[PDB]
Amino acid sequence: PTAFYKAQPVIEFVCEVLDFKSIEEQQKPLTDSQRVKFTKEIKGLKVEITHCGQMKRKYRVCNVTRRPASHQTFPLTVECTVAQYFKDRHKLVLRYPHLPCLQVGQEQKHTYLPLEVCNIVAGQRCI
Amino acid sequence: GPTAFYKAQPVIEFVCEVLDFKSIEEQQKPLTDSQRVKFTKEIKGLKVEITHCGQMKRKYRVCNVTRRPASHQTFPLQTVECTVAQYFKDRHKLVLRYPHLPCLQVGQEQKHTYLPLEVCNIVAGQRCIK
RNA sequence: CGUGACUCU
RNA sequence: CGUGACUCU
């Protein structure tokens, strides 16, 4: 019988996946086990971003990063952390630097989005 | 004014509301100029999505309503002018149910894209502005 | 629906 | 319940 994921912040989504009532029950990085579990649930879902104003760009998740936003880097040739880049480009100080990022789009484009700036898009079937 | 959004609904139903019909069957002939001008004023600038392509629910934004009904409106088909109704029967296997109603013109005008009303839905979430 | 774009990460 | 676009017409 068809059911659709509730449209909601990805932070709340990972709480429900990992069985916290609040995200504060996780004030450290995910274990590998928790990452794998989360990845299995969110991979293939669309999310939309929240940090660029009314430009709510939509992406599909292809992976969850193995590093917290505070340590995950991408070739910016130099390297920048995601948490830093979101400081240096969008002037947002990540509230959850220790949680990983969603990788979206084509893998080669190394687009990482903090869980913080993503909402689950409405209307997608939960199987 | 306070934000409101148009109901997502088939454009045929939308046009019955604009023209105060309860049923489109009340309009068995082409629109008059005045009926067309009233309709146009309401749908112009709204996004629609089409229904004649399976799950490819392609969206376009309305820029005008054609003067001629789909049975008589034409565009350059690769070159020869072809009626909209004829093209839809040939390409889409769709014999129009309301060939006597006009088309929405959509997108950039130069592309001469005309859509029969019956293949269009008003897209949800569009502001209705006083 | 899907995807590309809004110089992104 | 941002804009634009293709798979048109």
Helix (H/G/I), strand (E/B), else coil: B59: strand
Q: What is the rounded distance in angstroms from the CA atom of residue A21 to the CA atom of residue A30?
A: 16
Experimental method: X-ray
User: What resolution in angstrom units was achieved for this structure?
Assistant: 1.9
Give the C-alpha distances (Å, rounded to integers) separating B125 from A27, A68, A115, B9: 38, 36, 26, 11
Residues contacting residue A93 through CB under 8 Å, at least 6 positions apart: A86, A87
Residue with tokens 């409106």: B73
Residue nearest to nucleotide D9 (CA to C1'): B113
**What residue type is assigned to position A102 of the chain?**
L
Question: Dihedral, CA atoms, A61, A66, A68, A72, nearest 10 degrees?
Answer: -90
Residue with tokens 């392509």: B53
CATH classification of the domain holding B66? 2.170.260.10
Total domains in the fold of chain A:
1
Q: What is the rounded distance in angstroms from the CA atom of residue B119 to the CA atom of residue B46?
A: 15
Q: At what angle do helices B11-18 and B33-43 cross, to 10 degrees?
A: 120
The range of the structural domain enclosing residue A39 comes to 1-127
Q: What is the rounded distance in angstroms from the CA atom of residue A102 to the CA atom of residue A46?
A: 11
Kindly report the three-state secondary structure assignment for every residue of A11-62. HHHHHHHHCCCCHHHCCCCCCHHHHHHHHHHHCCCEEEECCCCCCCCEEEEE
Output the distance from B22 CA to C6 C1' rounded to whole Å: 42
Q: What is the rounded distance in angstroms from the CA atom of residue B100 to the CA atom of residue B15?
A: 14
Find out whether B68 and B86 touch, Cβ atoms under 8 Å.
no
A95 touches strand C (CB under 7 A): no
Decide: residue B65, CB within 10 A, 0-12 exposed, 13-18 middle, 19+ buried.
Answer: buried
Which positions on chain D have an atom < 7 Å from some protein CB? 1-9
**Widest Cα–Cα separation across chain A:** 50
Find out whether B121 and B49 touch, Cβ atoms under 8 Å.
yes
Find out whether A38 and A14 touch, Cβ atoms under 8 Å.
yes
Helix (H) or strand (E) holding A82: helix A82-88
Q: What is the rounded distance in angstroms from the CA atom of residue A79 to the CA atom of residue A64?
A: 19
- Label residues B91-123 b or e (16+ Cβ within 10 Å = b): eeebebebbbbbbbbbeeeeeeebbbbbbbbbb
Cβ neighbour number for residue A26 with a 10 Å cutoff: 17
Which one, of B106, B129, B110, B115, lies nearest residue B51 by Cα? B115
B59 touches strand D (CB under 7 A): yes
CA B111 to chain centre: 16
The token pair that represents B32 in the structure block:
């008059």
CA B54 to chain centre: 18
Q: What is the rounded distance in angstroms from the CA atom of residue A102 to the CA atom of residue A30?
A: 13
A13 touches strand C (CB under 7 A): no
Which one, of A85, A89, A38, lies nearest residue A66 by Cα? A38
Helix (H) or strand (E) holding B77: strand B74-77
